[PDB]
Amino acid sequence: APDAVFGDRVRRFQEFLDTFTSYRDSVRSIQVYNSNNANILPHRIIISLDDLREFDRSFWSGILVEPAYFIPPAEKALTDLADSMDDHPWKLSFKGSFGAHALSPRTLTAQHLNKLVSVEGIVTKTSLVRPKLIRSVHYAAKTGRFHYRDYTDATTTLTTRIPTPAIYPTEDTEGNKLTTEYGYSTFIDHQRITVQEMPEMAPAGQLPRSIDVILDDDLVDKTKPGDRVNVVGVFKSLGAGGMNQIGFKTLILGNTVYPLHARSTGVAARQMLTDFDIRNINKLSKKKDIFDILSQSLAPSIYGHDHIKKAILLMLMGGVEKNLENGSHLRGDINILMVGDPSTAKSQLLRFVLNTASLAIATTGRGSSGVGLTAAVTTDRETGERRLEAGAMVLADRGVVCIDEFDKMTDVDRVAIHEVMEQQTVTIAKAGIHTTLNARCSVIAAANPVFGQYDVNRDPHQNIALPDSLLSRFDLLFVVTDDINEIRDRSISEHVLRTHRYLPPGYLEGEPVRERLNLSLAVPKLVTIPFLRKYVQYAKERVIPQLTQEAINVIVKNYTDLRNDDNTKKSPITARTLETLIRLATAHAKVRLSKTVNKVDAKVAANLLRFALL
Amino acid sequence: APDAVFGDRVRRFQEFLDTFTSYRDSVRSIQVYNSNNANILPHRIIISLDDLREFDRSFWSGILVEPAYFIPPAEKALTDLADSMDDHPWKLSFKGSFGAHALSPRTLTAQHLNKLVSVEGIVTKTSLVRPKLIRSVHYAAKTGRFHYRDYTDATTTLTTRIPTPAIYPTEDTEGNKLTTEYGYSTFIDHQRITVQEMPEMAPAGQLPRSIDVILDDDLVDKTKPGDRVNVVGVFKSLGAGGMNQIGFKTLILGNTVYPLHARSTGVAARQMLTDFDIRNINKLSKKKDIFDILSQSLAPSIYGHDHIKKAILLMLMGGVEKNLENGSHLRGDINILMVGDPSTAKSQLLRFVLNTASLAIATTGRGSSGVGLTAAVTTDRETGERRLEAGAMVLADRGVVCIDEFDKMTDVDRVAIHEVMEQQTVTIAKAGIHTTLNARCSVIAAANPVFGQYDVNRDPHQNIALPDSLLSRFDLLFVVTDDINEIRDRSISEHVLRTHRYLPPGYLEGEPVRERLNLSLAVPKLVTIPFLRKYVQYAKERVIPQLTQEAINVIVKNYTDLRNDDNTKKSPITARTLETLIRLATAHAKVRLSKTVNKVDAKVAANLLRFALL
DNA sequence: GCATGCATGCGCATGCATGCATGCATGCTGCATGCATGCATGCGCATGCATGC
DNA sequence: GCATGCATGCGCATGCATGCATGCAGCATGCATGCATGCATGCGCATGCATGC
Ligand SMILES: Nc1ncnc2c1ncn2[C@@H]1O[C@H](COP(=O)(O)OP(=O)(O)O)[C@@H](O)[C@H]1O
Ligand SMILES: Nc1ncnc2c1ncn2[C@@H]1O[C@H](COP(=O)(O)OP(=O)(O)O)[C@@H](O)[C@H]1O
Ligand SMILES: [Mg+2]
Ligand SMILES: [Mg+2]
Structure with a gap:
């Protein structure tokens, strides 16, 4: 029956949702979507704990300290x-x-039980998504009637209830046999999923700490093993820790x-692009x-x-790949090598x-070998099947791989x-x-010359030594x-000494500058990084530009000219x-944002290739 | 959760209550009463099982046969x-x-269990009206909050439920002590009450059969021991008849x-008086x-x-009694005696x-003696107190008592x-x-002359012989x-032979006429009984007539005249x-329905008394 | 007016529906034992590659 | 070209998280007896009345 405290807590959260009206229209939007568009969206919104502090301090403190009394009220208020x-x-x-x-x-202890927490770490393993039965419907051929039942468990309500262990019905109240209607x-x-502390925040040479997170319904397939994650939820104690007869069972309900x-x-x-950002772009x-x-x-x-500065940007944007009806794939990635x-x-x-780069993986010579680049096979304890866990290059799909010390790799790789x-x-x-x-x-990639330093007397085949x-x-x-x-020694020295003397905005000189780990969130003057x-x-x-009938002639001329020319080049043609x-x-x-390739771009490409060749 | 069958049974009873609209206005009337008049009336109405047969036959058959499935639906439909x-x-x-x-x-057997029945008989004993606790409210002085709880039992719902044995709260969810608020x-x-078969329908010389009826709330004080009653209710089996370890516990829920x-x-x-009846009256x-x-x-x-015919009517209507501020009571009943x-x-x-007569008790000479007329003392098994059960004259209050053979009684009575x-x-x-x-x-009362027949030679004191x-x-x-x-012999003979030859309307001569027991219900041409x-x-x-200044003189004259007159009278003055x-x-x-006594009435009274005296 | 037998209350004795604790034994059940099973581990040996000479 | 040493996969024993039945015992519940208690029975005895003579 109704509780007065529950009612007042609902009323105050109705006032909160009324004062800051940025959350009502968000709810409007999801119904607008699910009606106009009939990918049904889930029924959820996001609240700021900063707004709560300004509106009410005690209600804020209560969700931080007593979620199991202020969350169901807020959810019911939202549903209303x-x-x-x-x-x-x-x-x-x-x-x-x-x-x-x-x-x-590591710093999550038994004094934080029953409170809402934020946890950082790495996802180490995810399980198989399984269905859960809530309501089951039946049919009786001797009476033409359909019957149903409900099921529940302890991981669906934040407060403790008295258990109801109902049974699976096979028989009617008179004895008639029932058919099970799986579609109804x-x-x-x-x-x-399991979470663990990130390797670059954990103490070296010490075993790691982990925590279990339970997800249901819509939050069920948001991550994969080997991801940086932040999770918020209630730290719950479950069951009886052996007092009916190690301690209590603890987990986070995400x-x-x-x-x-x-x-x-x-x-x-x-990043999310603002219209102001678009205007400058x-x-x-x-x-x-x-x-x-x-x-x-x-x-x-x-x-x-400067030419390598150009080439890196060209690689960062890249061309376009093409698939034919036949089933053929034609490449569109650019690759760079540097010897110096x-x-x-x-x-x-x-x-x-x-x-x-938005997605990049770093590898150094002999560091990664064999399966470390392509993929490896493991076994799953529960189901017993053989699975694959991705190597460096399988993970860096639609991205970049940085190989330092390229010449140190074996022929097998x-x-x-x-x-x-x-x-x-693969x-x-x-x-x-x-x-x-x-x-x-x-x-x-970057490689070292075979003779320590580049020998101008010998030809490239004797300095590079790659197939x-x-x-x-x-x-x-x-x-x-x-x-x-001497001219370039002076010029370079002065510039390098310029760089080595620089005050970050807001320090008195002398004060050491401070290091922080940069964790991001996912969704002639120089321009900011x-x-x-x-x-x-x-x-x-x-x-996504298309090819024109103009520049094909330039490309044809350059290719024919290079293949029927007799200068010693730095690469085969x-x-x-x-x-x-x-x-x-x-x-x-792609740099110009035009819808078609043009002639000036073709000549820039030709110029760059010919500088890198001759 | 909602049942389809319950819903349809409610819907059909909504249609029934809509077609015959004589029950809606009756419900209107009780709310009108309880609002305008603030003796609060109870929330109840009466339905005809004859209307149900005409409207729907299966719904009628279901209430007769399956009350425990069609009564809660109808009650909910009425509440709506x-x-x-x-x-x-x-x-x-x-x-x-x-x-x-x-x-x-006697004819109520085990094949009528779980059906609605009508039972006739006599009420033999009623118990003490006791309160029953439903909801209890409490107070905590350490938190300023009030708490409540609900209680239920098996004799309040017609269908079987799973028991919930809740306990009486003395303590708060933290341990705070609670004060009990009896007024809230x-x-x-x-x-x-217990019912038994009426003595004039039961077989002579055979022990009687009885049945238990449970009443609650408004139906709790409608009858007294020693009454003819008709009860309608569900014949219920309760508990387990020893199968957890005589038979089942059976009773009627009135x-x-x-x-x-x-x-x-x-x-x-x-009887209920119609306006048409009033007009003739x-x-x-x-x-x-x-x-x-x-x-x-x-x-x-x-x-x-004919004069006794007059006197009986005068007794049947009777005068008016009067109470003074002092505390004095003055009688207003008439009494008659007959000797012949x-x-x-x-x-x-x-x-x-x-x-x-509307209420009358028959007693014959020595038949009733001592306590049988006034009252007697009994003991109650449960409470152990000494109580009184009424005699003939205590029961016949505001009524008449008929004593045949009056002269056979002893001086003690x-x-x-x-x-x-x-x-x-008394x-x-x-x-x-x-x-x-x-x-x-x-x-x-009626008495016999002492000498078998009235002796005109002797004076009345020797024929009557009463103090x-x-x-x-x-x-x-x-x-x-x-x-x-001879004249009156012829006249009386012919009339008596007239009476002894009479056909009730609707019989062919020869057919025996049929006897029935007449049980009533409570709430110059000759006029019908x-x-x-x-x-x-x-x-x-x-x-209720009042006395005037006119007829007092007539009464005064007659009384003075009689007391100062010297004829041998048949009674003292x-x-x-x-x-x-x-x-x-x-x-x-009272016969004339006038608001005041008058002179003609006084002279009729005087004439009647003087005929009965001389 | 006197003598008599009946019906009315006293004054014994006994049985009887309620009700609750105690010692014995019933009847279940939580605990300790034994064991099948299949996945992972810690290991020594055979092959193919990289680094001199 | 030729001789050598390291990384990778093949082959072999062993331990160990799950999981379930059975004999034995510990353990609490329901049952049989034993009695205390207060009410009602029914049974002879004394008194006041109604009837006969
Ligand atoms: N052209 C350059 N301009 C500025 N700094 C340079 C330049 N070349 C080298 N340096 C500096 O000298 C060092 C080069 O070290 P490193 O990056 O290991 O060189 P490499 O990779 O070529 O062996 C760094 O401090 C780098 O900042
Ligand atoms: N005056 C009368 N008129 C009609 N019938 C009478 C009259 N007197 C007596 N009777 C009849 O004679 C019988 C009298 O019997 P009952 O009532 O016992 O008389 P009582 O009570 O006077 O001794 C009945 O059948 C009654 O109907
Ligand atoms: Mg380097
Ligand atoms: Mg008579």
């Missing part, structure tokens, strides 16, 4: 408003600043699950020095190397690409990369498993050297060069 | 209509013809309780021979005895008064009747009991004799004669 604006229950989500309830699996019963899905992005991880980074295009402004802002601290002297900032260039750089498929034929996986990735088959699979092979000089990602993200999703020219041409048209 | 017309639950009652479900406690809790009353009237019983007879008055027409219709089959020869139809006159005929109180002083009871009754104290307590002493003759009761009932309730004249005068004014 939903049924009000209406011409299936509803549930809430939580965001804002939590404070002392922003914990990790209701089933709701279930999944369980309500919010946020994917997070980190360096060298399989979760991509995306589109304004920048018309000025006909877009390429130079964007190129010089690519790690401006390294000096020169042992103090030419190769690793700074690689690390910058790792920091800026080289033959495996031959298949990824051209067909972009084929596995192990005991019982025969499957093909997708790996559509671009590759950037022609692998060389042809790289679109661009750049060579760089540091010529000892945070804006370059916004530019690229729009430039890939929106523009094949049909791969023919396709490379088109990929390069379409990348520049 | 009540809450509809509204600008606490409601319940039903049943009347009409039942058929094979009109049984007695809800209590509903309870009573149990819904309807009707009092019935029978000859020589304490339940009065009343009031029309008859204006004609100035009302007394003669009503008098000659009093058992017309007995011949002559052994073939003068005395007992026919007595039996006619027994059959016609005569002294007890001295107190009833004058002060109309005083009991037994061990522990000292109480005074009300007995306001009129008395008619002057008792004679003065009788208003009228009539004497009658049969004078052997059924109408005389209607006349008397209105004449007593409505008219006292102030009892003075009061008798006023009682007689006011009775005739």
